[PDB]
């Protein structure tokens, strides 16, 4: 937030609405300043988040952060399969597996 303040920007109109709903949720202390409240939410790991489709915010403050995530060995590329007709089995004449 500090950088933002220095860059010459104040609380966005939307951050105010989210802060409203927030103090309605008992998340921030009423009467405290917008910056103080946004910080109060940040300490809870929540941030004001903007829906990229609308531009409107998410009604509540939301948990955002860095998570470590792995791509596991199971990929559709390996697993996707289909068959019309194909190899049958010696004795049973039923399709192979």
């Amino acid at each position: 937030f500090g950088k933002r303040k220095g860059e010459g920007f104040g609380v966005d109109k939307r951050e105010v609405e989210v802060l409203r709903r927030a103090e309605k949720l008992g998340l921030v202390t009423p009467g405290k300043t917008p910056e103080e409240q946004l910080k109060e939410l940040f300490l809870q790991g929540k941030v004001v988040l903007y829906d990229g489709r609308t531009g409107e915010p998410i009604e509540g403050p939301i948990v955002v952060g860095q998570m470590f995530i792995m791509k596991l060995y199971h990929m559709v590329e390996d697993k996707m399969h289909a068959r019309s007709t194909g190899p049958y089995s010696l004795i049973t004449q039923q399709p192979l597996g």
């Binding site: 920007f9 966005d12 109109k13 939307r14 489709r53 531009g55 409107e56």
Partner: protein
């Protein structure tokens, strides 16, 4: 009661960044104008990207060059970061040549200079070379839109050319602030600020203008009912 055309302010730092203010605007127009532009900016703004690469003595991306520290994979990954501006708008394709060797750290500035082509980040590290290490390549650069994966375009100038993923969009980031404003009689007016970062190939401003043109052009499509 009817509002009148707002003041349009422009604050620029070089070709990289811009801030664009519009005030005042009727309540709600902060995002009504802000968002569709952000979307268009992030998506539909034409730029330039490296489409293909040809390394002398390299058959495919999974190769490795003697004398060079970087595998062809990492090299391509670096060329992916090359931002090249075309001065002449009639020009839709370029081929940069780079021939280097000996104990040097190659950068984007080591490309043989071409007319009407400016490398916005000549400081960009490309490959680290060693004694006897020779790196000689031809990298093709195209103008295009959005994100087109190597698999899609499959662009090869020659037999051993390696198609590269093209992130065309010159726009790195877009934000917009909507702040409170008044004309004293009216409260709840909102001022809009579009903060726009770029690679430098096009300019936050140029970007913006292209975005608006795209949007209005789209509004045109509502012309002929049926």
């Amino acid at each position: 009661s009817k509002l009148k055309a707002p003041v349009f302010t422009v604050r620029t730092q070089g070709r990289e960044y811009g801030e664009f203010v519009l005030e005042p605007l009727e309540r709600g127009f902060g995002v009504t104008l802000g968002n569709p532009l952000r979307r268009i900016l992030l998506s539909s703004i034409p730029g330039t990207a490296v489409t293909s690469v040809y390394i002398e003595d390299v058959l495919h991306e999974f190769s490795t060059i003697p004398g060079v520290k970087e595998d062809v994979v990492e090299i391509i990954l670096n060329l992916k970061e090359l931002v090249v501006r075309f001065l002449n708008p009639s020009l839709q394709t370029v081929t940069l040549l780079l021939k280097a060797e000996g104990p040097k750290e190659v950068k984007a500035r080591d490309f043989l200079p071409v007319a009407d082509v400016e490398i916005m980040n000549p400081d960009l590290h490309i490959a680290t070379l060693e004694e006897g290490g020779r790196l000689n390549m031809e990298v093709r650069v195209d103008r295009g839109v959005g994100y087109v994966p190597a698999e899609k375009h499959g662009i090869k100038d020659r037999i051993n050319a390696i198609p590269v993923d093209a992130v065309f969009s010159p726009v790195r980031r877009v934000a917009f602030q909507v702040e409170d404003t008044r004309l004293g009689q009216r409260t709840d007016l909102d001022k809009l600020t579009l903060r726009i970062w770029t690679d430098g190939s096009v300019t936050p401003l140029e970007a913006l203008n292209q975005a608006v043109e795209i949007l209005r052009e789209h509004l045109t499509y509502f012309s002929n009912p049926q």
